[PDB]
Design a protein around this nucleic acid. Structure first.
Lengths: 48, 197, 170, 49, 106
RNA sequence: UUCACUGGGCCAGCAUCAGUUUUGGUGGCAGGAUAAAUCCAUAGGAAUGUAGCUUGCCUCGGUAAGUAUUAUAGCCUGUGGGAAUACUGCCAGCUGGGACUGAGGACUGCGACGUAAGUCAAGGAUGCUGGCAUAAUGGUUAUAUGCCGCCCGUCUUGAAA
RNA sequence: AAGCUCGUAUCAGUUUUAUGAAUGUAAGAAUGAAGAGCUUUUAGUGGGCCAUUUUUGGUAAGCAGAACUGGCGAUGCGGGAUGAACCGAACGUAGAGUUAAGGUGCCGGAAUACACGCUCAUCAGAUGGCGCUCAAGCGUGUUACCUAUACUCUACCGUCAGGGUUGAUAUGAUGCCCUGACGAGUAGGCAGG
């Protein structure tokens, strides 16, 4: 109920950048996609 | 930072020098390269001699007299290496090249005037120790240019006329070094030193 | 840049199988998540498991003991290639375990074109007593009172125009 | 009440981790029960599934 | 006696551009003796003037001025973005541009 | 008719603000081997063996054979103690510099601050100041400069043709 | 397009458990969606090619055929020097900020950045040109920067959706408003001028 009440967030592109040269690889091998576990906080705060 | 910036090819690298001289023009920075002949490239001689002749066989078909005019004179050899990075067509260019002046040797009215060097384009600061590297001079000679001699001689003369100068000067600043050395220590001095001078 | 991680796993305990064998190994990685990912890849090579069947029990950093003492690291490495995989031993004179494995990865890329995915680090061990140094280029620095110059110094000019004609003495 | 609750939550995770190393055991941390998913690729050339 | 200069002199390089598109609104300015973005941070917000002779006399002077502001840095060299009221003529690519010391942070 | 007060636009500068964002300086914490180190001790060890001592040798005290565990340098490992400091993370911490925007139009509402009276950065910019009528400003045409722009329409074929 | 029941538990290019020989049926499973079904009728439409993944037939090779999902078709924009098939990105008009893909010697906006090594080639190499050799090449890592019509915020235009508004509103209630979302387009359809 609380999640569905919240509208899907509209984030800007990250303030610093994505870090990586190429975005579309897994995070485990120098990309952006997939699970990043804890570093998502660093990413979303720049995207905020 | 100086209306004109006379440069001295002597011990440089066609490409790098050029390039940097290029930018300097497109940004309104008059220039004047000298000693052109005593310029430098990279790689054995037999090299640049080829990577050129090829540029020689060029020429247009029907009318060889209307094609790639192969300039021998170094100054030019280099001037090309440059006009190659400068739209040299759109007025913005023409406006440049119009800001250049590559001489072979060092003729007046510059002889008498300071020069400099583009530390980011020195054989001795880019080429790994002991490693083949042309010297335009020969290169030009080998392919036409009929004066390497004149400049040559007609050069040494310039170095003289000067060398002699320096002396007079050096012999002059030998005094100053003393004038102050003595007039040094006093007061008025001390103070300065404190502030830094 | 790298960090060293101590990872342990035990293929989730089932009925009549209480507390399994706990496979311990030291992993070099840039961060915690990559260390976990590499750990599963090594478990599947040594034996028959999967990521879903097991659990990461504890993942802890291992700081280097004395990062002010110059050591001699003798590293064993297994790595994939264009041909079949093959074992290797190299020697690195360095400060820490982490800096040693770092310079190894750069050297492996330089001389063999092997990326991080291709390389398994078998075992990193110090060489305490000299004369166990099998390589020449490491033994090279172990002579008494090594005094050498660094001639022909490339001095970086921030400005584009110099007025002195740079004389590269040292 | 929530400020006190979050504080005591993280402190009990810290304390449990400290108690494991002291007792020579291993504390499993609580399985992460919430993710935040951010779209990374555009609208086009995406498969149906 | 010689120097009445209360401005740092810098050249007008180009417009903000890609390979194939240029925005003429934002001009790129090289400033003398500025090497980094950190040194350029001082010059942010300072008023710029491009001073030039014209043919016809307008207000008892044959000299006209375009005024503008530094907006932000541009790359690692100390090249600086700059928006004027009326954009600079593009004929001035490589022309001297006077960067003043007002308004002062210091 | 005596006077006193006052001027409406347009474009700007500054001030305090508000929404967005960029770039600094600075402080307090919380994690880890309750950082690891270093350092202060302590007990062993070997050396790329320091002082000393022993022996072949000019070149003035020499140079490799030993001796020796540090002596007229030190190092390494262990053991114990004492603080830090990076690193990761947090602050509903503080203090700046720059750009862009000012939408809306009596008052209602959510609030903060103040004992109250009120006031405020709280349901979207106000205040001050300057430039004017031979103005200020704004436009048209002519070309120049930087960048970009395949010849329109119909009809085919998988689109170019 | 309209009318009729409903506005729901009506479903979904999805995952999960359950039950059989990638694959069938159910859930008091998750996640999303207030956009569903029943009539009734009305335009346009019968082009392939390339690529992907399974095979089937195959000798010097190439490939030949079948099925499956995309790309172009009806589609601009940033990048790949230039381009039907690559890379990024689905477009109202602007202002500011941040990025993608690709790059930062110069032409060319952006580091002649930092760090570890390797490479001398008598037409190296990565080449679009000039040019390059402790590179402007190769392998790799670390940051910094450049910019699209992409994302974020704000204004503005219009469209759609929800709503306020009378003992009448300091403007034609077929007015005056308040809130949010959206914007490519050929054949064709509807509507306002």
């Amino acid at each position: 109920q609380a999640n569905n009440f919240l509208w899907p967030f509209k984030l800007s592109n990250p303030s610093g950048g994505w870090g990586v040269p190429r975005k579309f690889k897994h995070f485990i091998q120098g990309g952006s996609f997939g699970n990043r576990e804890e570093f998502i906080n660093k990413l979303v705060k720049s995207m905020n | 930072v100086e209306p004109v910036v006379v440069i001295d090819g002597k011990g440089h690298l066609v490409g790098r020098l050029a390039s940097v001289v290029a930018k300097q023009l497109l940004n309104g920075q008059k220039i004047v390269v000298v000693r052109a002949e005593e310029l430098n490239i990279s790689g054995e001689f037999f090299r640049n001699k080829l990577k050129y002749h090829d540029f020689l066989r060029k020429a247009t078909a029907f009318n060889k007299t209307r094609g790639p005019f192969h300039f021998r004179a170094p100054s030019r050899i280099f001037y090309k290496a440059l006009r190659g990075m400068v739209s040299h067509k759109t007025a913005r260019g023409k406006a440049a090249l119009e800001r250049l002046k590559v001489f072979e040797g060092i003729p007046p009215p510059y002889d008498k005037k300071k020069r400099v060097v583009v530390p980011q384009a020195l054989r001795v600061l880019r080429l790994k120790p002991g490693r083949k590297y042309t010297t335009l001079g020969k290169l030009s000679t080998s392919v036409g240019w009929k004066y390497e001699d004149v400049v040559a001689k007609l050069e040494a003369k310039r170095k003289v006329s000067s060398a002699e100068y320096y002396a007079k000067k050096r012999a002059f600043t030998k005094k100053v070094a003393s004038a102050n050395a003595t007039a040094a220590e006093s007061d008025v001095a001390k103070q300065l030193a404190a502030l830094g001078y | 840049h790298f960090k060293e991680y101590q990872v342990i796993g035990r293929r989730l305990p089932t009925e009549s199988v209480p507390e399994p064998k706990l496979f311990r190994m030291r992993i070099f990685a840039s961060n915690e998540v990559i260390a976990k990912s590499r750990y599963w890849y090594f478990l599947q090579k040594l034996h028959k498991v999967k990521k879903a069947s097991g659990e990461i029990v504890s993942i802890n950093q291992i700081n280097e003991a004395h990062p002010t003492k110059v050591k001699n690291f003798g590293v064993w490495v297994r790595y994939d290639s264009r041909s079949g995989t093959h074992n290797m031993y190299k020697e690195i004179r360095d400060v820490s375990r982490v800096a040693a494995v770092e310079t190894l990865y750069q050297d492996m890329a330089a001389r063999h074109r092997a990326r991080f995915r291709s390389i398994h680090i078998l075992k990193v061990a110090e060489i305490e007593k000299t004369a166990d140094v099998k390589r020449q280029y490491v033994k090279q620095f172990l002579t008494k009172d090594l005094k050498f110059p660094l001639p022909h110094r490339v001095q970086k000019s921030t400005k584009t125009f110099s007025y002195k004609r740079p004389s590269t003495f040292y | 009440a929530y400020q006190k609750e979050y504080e005591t939550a993280e402190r009990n995770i810290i304390q449990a981790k400290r108690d494991a190393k002291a007792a020579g055991s291993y504390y499993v941390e609580a399985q992460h029960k919430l993710v935040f998913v951010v779209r990374i690729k555009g609208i086009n050339k995406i498969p149906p599934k | 006696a010689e120097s009445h200069r209360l401005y740092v002199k810098g050249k007008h390089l180009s417009y903000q551009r890609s390979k194939r598109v240029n925005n003429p609104n934002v001009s790129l300015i090289k400033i003398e003796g500025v090497a980094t973005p950190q040194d350029a941070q001082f010059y942010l917000g300072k008023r710029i003037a491009y001073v030039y002779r014209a043919s016809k006399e307008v207000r008892g002077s044959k000299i006209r001025v375009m005024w503008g502001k530094v907006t932000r840095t541009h790359g690692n060299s100390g090249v600086v973005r700059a928006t004027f009221r009326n954009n600079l003529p593009a004929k001035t690519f490589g022309a001297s541009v006077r960067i003043f010391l007002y308004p002062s942070n210091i």
